[PDB]
Amino acid sequence: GSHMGLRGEYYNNMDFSRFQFVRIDPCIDFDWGEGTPDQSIGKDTYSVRWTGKVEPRYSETYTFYTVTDDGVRLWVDGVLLIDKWKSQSATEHSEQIYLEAGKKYDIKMEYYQHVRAASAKLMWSSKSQQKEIIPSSQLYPSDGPLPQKDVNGLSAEYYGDAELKDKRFTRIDDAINFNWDKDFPVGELKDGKFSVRWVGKIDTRYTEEYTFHTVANGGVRVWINNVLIIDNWQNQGKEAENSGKIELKAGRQYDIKVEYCNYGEPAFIKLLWSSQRQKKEVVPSKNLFAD
């Protein structure tokens, strides 16, 4: 029965971002060694969500067990039974819940790999059920809404004043790398005065202290992880440079907000990053998510 199992959502980050593919796994019995579930998933920092329904054979006290590297969360019947979302070598965790023979219960298992070894196994036991891998005959995949690939770039609001007040249009900018060079991006302005807000998500290649850099002809603010790390909103200098630092982990998304105001100069703004292993560059569209 091709259809039996749970639906597995496979992401290339460890926080259920960078969605790659869905597939129906007949059971949760994976040992990926130091590798990945599929050639389309990169080594390290990945996550999997399995959802559907489990059907016990007996009306009894079930024990659910997870053996994972790294972390896990297990819901059965909307109860969070196991909450061990952490870095761990292969480790069993378990909890009990009372179920009724032949009833179909919601099950959701969230898993992630950080580094080194990766595995995920879901088992059950009861008075009459000898401890096994939960088999495909007792598991029904969810259907309903597939996950959506998010779009690269950031959601930009363009304003017809310098104070982020009069909103003219929204689009997705591939990156924050603009030399507008007197042809303002917004029409019908007074005194060349306009402003922009980019919102979305960013992820990094490396775990370490990043430095974000703005080069700008007007005022800038930058938030990363909802921390204000650049604040030069009054600036007028041509290609004025600001920097600010934040510690980030590879393999997960962080909020990003960038605000720009032009005070009538020919407009310019670039957002760069650097770190001990990241050489200074314009932050690339492939690390920016529009959400």
> Helix or strand or coil: residue 13?
coil
Among residue numbers 23 through 42, which ones bind Ca ion (CB under 5 A)? 42
State yes or no: residue 203 binds Ca ion (CB under 5 A).
no
- End-to-end CA separation in angstroms for the chain: 36
Q: What is the DSSP string of 129-159?
A: S-SEE--GGGEEE--SPPPPPPPBSEEEEEE
- Smallest gap, in angstroms, from Cβ of residue 13 to Ca ion? 6
Q: Which is nearer to Ca ion, 9 or 259 (CB)?
A: 9
List 25, 69, 203, 259, residue binding Ca ion (CB under 5 A): 69
* Tokens found for residue 76: 């059965």
Q: Which is nearer to Ca ion, 45 or 126 (CB)?
A: 45
Round to whole Å and give the CA distance between 113 and 72.
10
x/- binding map, residues 91-120, to Ca ion, per CB under 5 A?
----------------------xx-x----
State yes or no: residue 275 binds Ca ion (CB under 5 A).
no
Kindly indicate which of the ranges 69-77, 104-112, 122-130, 146-154 contains the residues binding Ca ion, using the contact rule CB under 5 A: 69-77
CA atoms 166, 188, 263, 200: torsion sign: positive
State yes or no: residue 51 binds Ca ion (CB under 5 A).
no
Residue nearest Ca ion (C-beta atom): 45
State yes or no: residue 45 binds Ca ion (CB under 5 A).
yes
Which residue's entry shows tokens 């590879």? 250
State yes or no: residue 68 binds Ca ion (CB under 5 A).
no
The identity of residue 68, as a single letter, is T
Q: Which is nearer to Ca ion, 34 or 281 (CB)?
A: 34
Strand partners, 83: 73
CB 118 within 8 A of CB 1: no
Binding site for Ca ion (CB under 5 A): 12, 42, 45-46, 69-70, 113-114, 116
